[PDB]
Design a protein around this ligand. Structure first.
Ligand code: HEM
Ligand SMILES: CC1(C)[C@@H]2CC[C@@]1(C)C(=O)C2
Ligand SMILES: [K+]
Length: 405
């Protein structure tokens, strides 16, 4: 159902795009979202779907809005409104300068230093998972690697039982790609019920894991509260279980269909970091937004206080104004422009971990399984939401062409 058009919204700016089920989804999710950048669509439109909200379609506007937190607040960053209001993760639900201290603490646990420290376990796991698959001559990448690799590394960092992964993944799936079984608030409360006793125990008997570090951290001179700890940890769980996990599948689906791109990285490995960046652009997958703090005219459009605006991080790099031939993958672009990891004060803190996991995957997989393809008769399907994903990715290969190291 489309929501009634608000009086202040001109009819020529309406474009009923459903971020949870785009029309051209069969052509791939990024392609489905790119229809918003066709010549028939204004730079800023209003969709009546999911309660009704604005959507900035150009990199220029997305960057702008993400910078101007005074007008575009993180307080209600998710669509639909019920989700945006229930969303209380730290520091994502706060605007500068309040998020400052909280962002610093989260940085201690998932920042650059920590990624350096865990580099060996990351390399270890990738190699391990891949050496297991190698002889099989086939695998469902989404469950055999995309999920275990990033998630187990996160469980290791947070000090959580790998036994809890299925329960935790389901809950985070409901917060990014809702299947209807639970509302955001319900998924959040279940997640919080899981976290609370664990935070309690670690505040009493502190450890070296991320949860202990956060739970016993200091924010602005005083100790962090159990609630604040819970809200930051809730966010870490989502980032850990529902980001790289989804992205790896888009990348590997592409590689499975691009023999020439695979060989290119095999021959010239020094290019992998650039290829990681290019894949991050072409297969960007996040889309959240902000809320108007007051009436405001943005690029000739009258925005009303309380209006929600989706600022798809995914679109900036697909914008032909930012990158020529945006849908083409070219590992040697002189500049890969994108906002895949966000923009503004909330720029992703886990980006260093994400890039390491991606780069390690690229090199390690290609070393052992240089030639692979999508299973014949496989119909790959994508799913859309706050973070898009791949339903399943059936891969097949000849073991005789692979090699152990
Ligand atoms: C492919 C990988 C990833 C992508 C595309 C991604 C994307 C994003 C985006 C777009 C934002 C900003 C959202 C906003 O402004 O409202 C963000 C923030 C954040 N990300 Fe990531 N992320 C990735 C991986 C991770 C991982 C592995 C973690 C770690 C668990 C993580 C933790 C965070 C945190 C804590 C923030 C909040 C920072 C703040 O509010 O100041 N992310 N991420
Ligand atoms: C939008 C995000 C990818 C970023 C990290 C996890 C996520 C869903 C958030 O809530 C902030
Ligand atoms: K909120």
């Amino acid at each position: 159902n489309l929501a009634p058009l608000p009086p202040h919204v001109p009819e020529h700016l309406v474009f009923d795009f459903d971020m949870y089920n785009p029309s051209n989804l069969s052509a791939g999710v990024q392609e489905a979202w790119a229809v918003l950048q066709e010549s028939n669509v204004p730079d800023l439109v209003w969709t009546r779907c999911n309660g009704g909200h604005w959507i900035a379609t150009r990199g220029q506007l997305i960057r702008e809005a993400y910078e101007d937190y005074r007008h575009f607040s993180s307080e209600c960053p998710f669509i639909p409104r019920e989700a945006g209001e229930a969303y209380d993760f730290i520091p994502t639900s706060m605007d500068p300068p309040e998020q400052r201290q909280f962002r610093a603490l989260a940085n201690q646990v998932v920042g650059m230093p920590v990624v350096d420290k865990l580099e060996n376990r990351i390399q270890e796991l990738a190699c391990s998972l891949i050496e297991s698959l190698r002889p099989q001559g086939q695998c469902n990448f989404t469950e055999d690697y995309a999920e275990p690799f990033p998630i187990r590394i996160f469980m290791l960092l947070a000090g959580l039982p790998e036994e809890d992964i299925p329960h935790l993944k389901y809950l985070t799936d409901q917060m990014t790609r809702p299947d209807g079984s639970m509302t955001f608030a319900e998924a959040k409360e279940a997640l919080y019920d899981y976290l609370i006793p664990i935070i309690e125990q670690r505040r009493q008997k502190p450890g070296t894991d991320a949860i202990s570090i956060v739970a016993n951290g200091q924010v602005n001179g005083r100790p962090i509260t159990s609630d604040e700890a819970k809200r930051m940890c809730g966010l870490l769980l989502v980032g850990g279980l529902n980001t790289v996990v989804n992205f790896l599948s888009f990348s590997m689906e592409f590689l499975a269909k691009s023999p020439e791109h695979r060989q290119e990285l095999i021959e010239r490995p020094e290019r992998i970091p650039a290829a990681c960046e290019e894949l991050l652009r072409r297969f960007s997958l996040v889309a959240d937004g902000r809320i108007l703090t007051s009436d405001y005219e943005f690029h000739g459009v009258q925005l009303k206080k309380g209006d929600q605006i989706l600022l798809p991080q995914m679109l900036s790099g697909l914008d032909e104004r930012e990158n020529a031939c945006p849908m083409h993958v070219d590992f040697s672009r002189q500049k890969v422009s994108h906002t895949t990891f966000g923009h503004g004060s909330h720029l992703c803190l886990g980006q260093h971990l994400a890039r390491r996991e991606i780069i390690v995957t690229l090199k390690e997989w290609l070393t052992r399984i240089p030639d692979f393809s999508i299973a014949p008769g496989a119909q790959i399907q994508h799913k859309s939401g706050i973070v898009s994903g791949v339903q399943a990715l059936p891969l097949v290969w000849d073991p005789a062409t692979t090699k152990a190291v």
